[PDB]
Write a protein that binds this ligand. Structure first.
Ligand SMILES: Nc1nc2c(ncn2[C@@H]2O[C@H](COP(=O)(O)OP(=O)(O)NP(=O)(O)O)[C@@H](O)[C@H]2O)c(=O)[nH]1
Ligand SMILES: [Ca+2]
Ligand SMILES: [Ca+2]
Ligand SMILES: [Mg+2]
Ligand SMILES: [Mg+2]
Length: 166
């Protein structure tokens, strides 16, 4: 069938693993175990097409960031994740997009900007700010909560739909 290689990137603690695990395994990981590099696979039907999703869950911690470049190289589409209660994670999105552009040697790589932890009330990144960033990149902005599952499928499926416009 059709395989889509998705890669989840972004600062430490923003919820990359929680997001991926919610999508693939349908539960919320409450604890924080920093990731090195993990992969998940799942068959799903997206807009009538049977899809194999290969999802790479990457390290956001510099200390665990080892050979992230080598893992990112294979990706066909990237979720760039920040947390809406972590202004620095938003400010650092550019670093991740730059790394993507380097590893893919392209300025045209499918991506979605994701503002996670939208269930939390200590918001310091307003939707409009993130929309403006996404607009400058020519990509969608979607808010998610790995905790409530809000927007989780939408984020990943939207990325698949971006890969398809490639
Ligand atoms: N309230 C809330 N907490 C969340 C959400 N997503 C993740 N968390 C919490 O935030 C912490 C970090 O989540 P995690 O998914 O491990 O982050 P990460 O981006 O994978 N970290 P790392 O880069 O170190 O691997 C965990 O305690 C997790 O429960 C969310 O949408 N809402
Ligand atoms: Ca643990
Ligand atoms: Ca390069
Ligand atoms: Mg993780
Ligand atoms: Mg402000």
């Amino acid at each position: 069938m059709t395989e889509y290689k998705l890669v989840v990137v972004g600062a430490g603690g923003v919820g990359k693993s929680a997001l991926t695990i919610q999508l693939i395994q349908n539960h919320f990981v409450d604890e924080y175990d920093p990731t090195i590099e993990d992969s998940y696979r799942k068959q799903v039907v997206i807009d009538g097409e049977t899809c194999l999703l290969d999802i790479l869950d990457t390290a956001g911690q510099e200390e665990y960031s080892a050979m992230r470049d080598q893992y990112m190289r294979t990706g066909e589409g990237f979720l760039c994740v920040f947390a809406i209660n972590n202004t620095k994670s938003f400010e650092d999105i550019h670093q991740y997009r730059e790394q993507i552009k380097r590893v893919k040697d392209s300025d045209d790589v499918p991506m979605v900007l994701v503002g996670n932890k939208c269930d939390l009330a200590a918001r310091t990144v307003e939707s409009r700010q993130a929309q403006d960033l996404a607009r400058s990149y020519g990509i969608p902005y979607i808010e998610t909560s790995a905790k409530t599952r809000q927007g989780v499928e939408d984020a990943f499926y939207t990325l698949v739909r971006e890969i398809r416009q490639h």
